[PDB]
Amino acid sequence: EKVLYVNNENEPTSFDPPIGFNNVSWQPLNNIMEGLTRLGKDHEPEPAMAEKWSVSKDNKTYTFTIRENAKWTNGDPVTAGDFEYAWKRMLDPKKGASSAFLGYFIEGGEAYNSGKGKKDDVKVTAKDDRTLEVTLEAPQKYFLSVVSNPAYFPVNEKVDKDNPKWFAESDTFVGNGPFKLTEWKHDDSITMEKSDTYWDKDTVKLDKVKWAMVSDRNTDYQMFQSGELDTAYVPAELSDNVNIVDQAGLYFYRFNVNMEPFQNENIRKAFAMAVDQEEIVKYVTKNNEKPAHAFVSPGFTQPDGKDFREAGGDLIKPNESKAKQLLEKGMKEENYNKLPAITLTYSTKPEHKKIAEAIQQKLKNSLGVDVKLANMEWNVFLEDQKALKFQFSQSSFLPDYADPISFLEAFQTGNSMNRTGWANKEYDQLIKQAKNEADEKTRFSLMHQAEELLINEAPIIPVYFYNQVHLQNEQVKGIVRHPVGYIDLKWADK
Ligand SMILES: C[C@H](N)C(=O)N[C@H](CCC(=O)N[C@@H](CCC[C@@H](N)C(=O)O)C(=O)O)C(=O)O
Numbered sequence: 156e157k158v159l160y161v162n163n164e165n166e167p168t169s170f171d172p173p174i175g176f177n178n179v180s181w182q183p184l185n186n187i188m189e190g191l192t193r194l195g196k197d198h199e200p201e202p203a204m205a206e207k208w209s210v211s212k213d214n215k216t217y218t219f220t221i222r223e224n225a226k227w228t229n230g231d232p233v234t235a236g237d238f239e240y241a242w243k244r245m246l247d248p249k250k251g252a253s254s255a256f257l258g259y260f261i262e263g264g265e266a267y268n269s270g271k272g273k274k275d276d277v278k279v280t281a282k283d284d285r286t287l288e289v290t291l292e293a294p295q296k297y298f299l300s301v302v303s304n305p306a307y308f309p310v311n312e313k314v315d316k317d318n319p320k321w322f323a324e325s326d327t328f329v330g331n332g333p334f335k336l337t338e339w340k341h342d343d344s345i346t347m348e349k350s351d352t353y354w355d356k357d358t359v360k361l362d363k364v365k366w367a368m369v370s371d372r373n374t375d376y377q378m379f380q381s382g383e384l385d386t387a388y389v390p391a392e393l394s395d396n397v398n399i400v401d402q403a404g405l406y407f408y409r410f411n412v413n414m415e416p417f418q419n420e421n422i423r424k425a426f427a428m429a430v431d432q433e434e435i436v437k438y439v440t441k442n443n444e445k446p447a448h449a450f451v452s453p454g455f456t457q458p459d460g461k462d463f464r465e466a467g468g469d470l471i472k473p474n475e476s477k478a479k480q481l482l483e484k485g486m487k488e489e490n491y492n493k494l495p496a497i498t499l500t501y502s503t504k505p506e507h508k509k510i511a512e513a514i515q516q517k518l519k520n521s522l523g524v525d526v527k528l529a530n531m532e533w534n535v536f537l538e539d540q541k542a543l544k545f546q547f548s549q550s551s552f553l554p555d556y557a558d559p560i561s562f563l564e565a566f567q568t569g570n571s572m573n574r575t576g577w578a579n580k581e582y583d584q585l586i587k588q589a590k591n592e593a594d595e596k597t598r599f600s601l602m603h604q605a606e607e608l609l610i611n612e613a614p615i616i617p618v619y620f621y622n623q624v625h626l627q628n629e630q631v632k633g634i635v636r637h638p639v640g641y642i643d644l645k646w647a648d649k
Pocket residue numbers: 176177178179402551552553554555621622623
């Protein structure tokens with residue numbers, strides 16, 4: 156028996172596909188479910204549930220043919236109807252999926268989600284059981300990548316109506332991906348087995364994947380040294396076994412611009428300019444992460460061949476003396492003799508505590524500001540963050556497709572990925588313009604203009620750009636970790 160041993164670190168938020176919208180949920184979900192496409196070894200979308208597609212001359216209407224003999228774990232056929240149902244479901248305002256904006260690529264999607272349009276004016280329709288037609292608002296070169304995103308995964312319509320909570324346990328789960336969910340001990344472990352109903356089961360070489368939920372990267376490393384894990388993190392305080400692989404996105408902090416004292420732009424800028432991202436990566440993380448002096452990470456090539464982040468340059472760098480000046484100026488503007496109490500809230504986990512402590516110490520040392528730390532587990536932390544309950548909070552962004560607009564759309568007014576209360580009409584206009592811009596050089600210019608404005612008003616503090624550095628059992632081969640998107644294990648062997 157070949158059993159791959161990995162660590163998920165924590166409990167998935169949700170296995171209802173559009174709901175989790177995070178690594179902890181979607182790393183495992185990506186291996187028990189499947190979209191129309193799946194990203195391959197070269198990170199390009201390849202036929203998965205769709206065996207092929209046709210695109211109209213105007214580049215807006217995609218017609219997908221569903222694989223013959225694609226089946227759910229319960230033996231039901233995977234139909235075009237399951238995709239139509241799932242996509243209209245994810246857009247349903249009553250559902251409140253944070254990922255619903257990803258459905259706005261579909262004509263009528265934004266209108267439906269916003270209550271200004273009808274469900275059946277969302278332009279996704281099953282023409283027959285094996286034919287799915289979708290019309291986009293505008294051409295989208297990354298659409299075939301987007302439909303590998305878990306938000307776009309099908310749901311078995313029959314199963315969903317019979318039991319609307321099917322996704323909540325292994326016993327009731329019905330999936331269509333390379334592995335079958337066979338055990339889910341909440342907060343302890345996940346087990347999945349090679350799925351004997353899967354269309355491409357002959358490709359799948361592993362018998363089982365077991366997912367631990369060990370949140371201490373030190374205990375992780377110990378489990379790797381003892382042989383209990385096939386893959387593991389590299390501990391900061393340590394330094395052929397090691398695999399360095401890119402991952403777009405960043406670690407950052409959010410302010411709430413409607414909670415004192417962060418209504419004042421100078422106070423926000425002061426805090427942002429106090430943080431020294433190089434010190435964080437050099438003295439805390441220590442996994443060769445790039446310090447983040449902007450929001451959009453490395454990895455996005457421009458029309459001119461340059462990297463977007465390289466071309467844009469640093470937008471925010473530590474400047475202690477200027478920070479002190481701006482804090483003084485902002486406090487005077489608000490008639491503050493002393494700053495109101497500030498709490499920095501992070502999600503309960505050793506790395507987040509160690510970074511929050513560094514930020515706490517730096518703010519004290521640079522500005523003389525005392526912040527108190529608070530923490531809660533990710534699942535409720537995320538709910539509270541979305542609800543705008545935190546003054547100042549640990550934040551993470553992974554792009555959903557491989558373009559800077561994935562990052563920049565986050566900070567539109569009221570966006571599910573904003574969570575700061577920041578509401579800049581000029582920013583909103585730049586994003587709208589970029590979303591409607593067919594000329595790529597122009598579109599890139601608009602995106603740099605937007606990013607400069609975002610960083611200038613400092614509703615956020617960028618900290619560091621991600622990567623995926625791991626130890627791996629040399630007897631495991633063929634794990635595919637993508638720069639944008641979730642781990643693929645279907646090709647792996649041991
Ligand atoms: C997926 C969606 N676009 C998005 O960004 N969701 C974020 C959550 C994004 C998210 O799961 N981060 C991960 C990133 C892990 C990066 C990895 N190298 C590491 O260092 O372990 C996390 O913090 O564990 C949201 O809802 O707040």
